[PDB]
């Protein structure tokens, strides 16, 4: 914590827009762990 070293002051259709595109098709799977059993 950097802040505690300071003194105190004295004064509906959302899921329907694009169902085909998802975030997790962008992230590589061997990014997090290497040595993955493919």
């Amino acid at each position: 914590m950097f802040s505690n070293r300071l003194p105190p002051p004295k004064h509906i259709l959302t899921d329907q827009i694009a169902k085909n595109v998802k975030l997790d098709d962008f992230i590589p799977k061997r990014q997090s762990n290497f040595e993955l059993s493919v």
Binding site: L23, I27, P28, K29, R30, Q31, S32, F34, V38
Partner: protein, 359 residues
């Protein structure tokens, strides 16, 4: 630790979703060490560009290469000497492939033809017919007596090998196909055209299992990994690795500011070569993506500056020897440099960049 500090305060719904987590994991992840490469011998003897090279998949004693003077040549691997020459195309030879089940050399060319050479008598046995323009690609099926060829025709033809009938034609792309790889289980043909897609084909049904649209430009080179059941696809600076049988994105390779990548190759112990059109040949770890060596091919005596570019490459069967053929009509062999250890030649020190948002 620090990710606990981020996760308890910012509270992502999925911890994998947030970018500081996906960047802290890569710094803690620590890739593997590989040895640096060097030049071993250089072999002259063609009268045009060395467009394509193939290796003996059994005995590892010779490597054949086709070229731009419309002749293929079988060179001795160990000594570098020229054993023999093969003519039979009238325009240049785009790709060669030697079978491992039968003594057959299937050569492909730009004059719209596909031929089958016997290696027991060194003659042409079987000619194949049906491509509207010049084929640029041969793979051979691992267990089923097929040929898969492709060109500017925008289709993949899967030739029977006995009756030489174009049995199955895969109609999917929107441009010439640059690479076709054959695969023994149900993503059986994996191709890559110049409309920035890579397709995984169901050859029994006739349709596509999955289209991979991640690249931005033409995919010029692909490679199968010998011990992994995964594929690597190259682009104009975008090398990715893909799993087969699902179609995942397994890893992105830090491959920026390298130019047009002509060829790829994959060693047994997770090395990935990627020779470029700017004469730069760069070596990657496969599981990580880290580029640990870059080299430049000094071209020739009275050559040009544009005439240095690796147009084709392969690895040895034992894997410790790289064979490239450059645009300066010459054949160059690269070597693992057995002396160096982890402390002597470390690499490029693994500093992944949060900027470019690709890691």
């Amino acid at each position: 630790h620090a990710s606990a500090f981020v996760n308890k305060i910012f509270q992502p719904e999925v911890a994998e979703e947030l970018i500081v987590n996906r960047y802290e994991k890569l710094l803690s992840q620590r890739p593997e060490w590989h040895a640096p490469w060097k030049l071993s011998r250089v072999i002259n003897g063609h009268l045009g560009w060395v467009r394509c090279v193939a290796i003996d998949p059994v005995d590892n004693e010779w490597f054949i290469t086709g070229s731009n003077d419309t002749t293929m040549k079988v060179w001795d691997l160990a000594t570098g000497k020229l054993k023999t020459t093969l003519a039979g195309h009238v325009m240049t030879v785009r790709d060669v492939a030697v079978s491992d089940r039968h003594p057959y050399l299937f050569s492909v060319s730009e004059d719209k033809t596909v031929k089958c050479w016997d290696l027991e008598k060194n003659q042409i046995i079987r000619d194949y017919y049906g491509h509207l323009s010049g084929v640029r690609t041969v793979s051979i099926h691992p267990t089923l007596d097929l040929i898969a060829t492709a060109g500017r025709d925008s289709v993949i033809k899967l030739w029977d090998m006995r009756t030489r009938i174009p049995v199955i034609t895969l109609v999917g792309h929107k441009g010439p196909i640059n690479q076709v790889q054959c695969t023994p289980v149900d993503p059986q043909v994996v191709s890559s055209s110049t409309d920035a897609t890579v397709r995984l084909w169901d050859v029994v049904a006739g349709k596509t299992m999955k289209v991979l649209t991640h690249h931005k430009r033409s995919v010029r080179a692909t490679a199968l990994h010998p011990k992994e059941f995964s594929v690597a696809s190259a682009c104009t600076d975008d090398i990715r690795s893909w799993g087969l049988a699902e179609g995942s994105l397994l890893t992105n390779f830090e491959s920026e500011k390298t130019g047009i990548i002509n060829t790829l190759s994959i060693n047994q112990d997770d090395v990935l070569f990627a020779g470029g059109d700017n004469g730069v040949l760069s070596f990657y770890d496969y599981k990580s993506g880290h580029k640990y060596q870059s080299l430049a091919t000094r071209e020739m005596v009275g050559s040009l500056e544009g005439e240095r570019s690796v147009l084709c490459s392969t690895f040895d069967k034992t894997g410790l020897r790289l064979i490239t053929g450059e645009a300066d009509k010459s054949i160059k062999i690269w070597k693992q440099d057995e002396t160096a250890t982890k402390e002597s030649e470390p690499g490029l020190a693994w500093n992944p960049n949060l900027s470019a948002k690709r890691f």
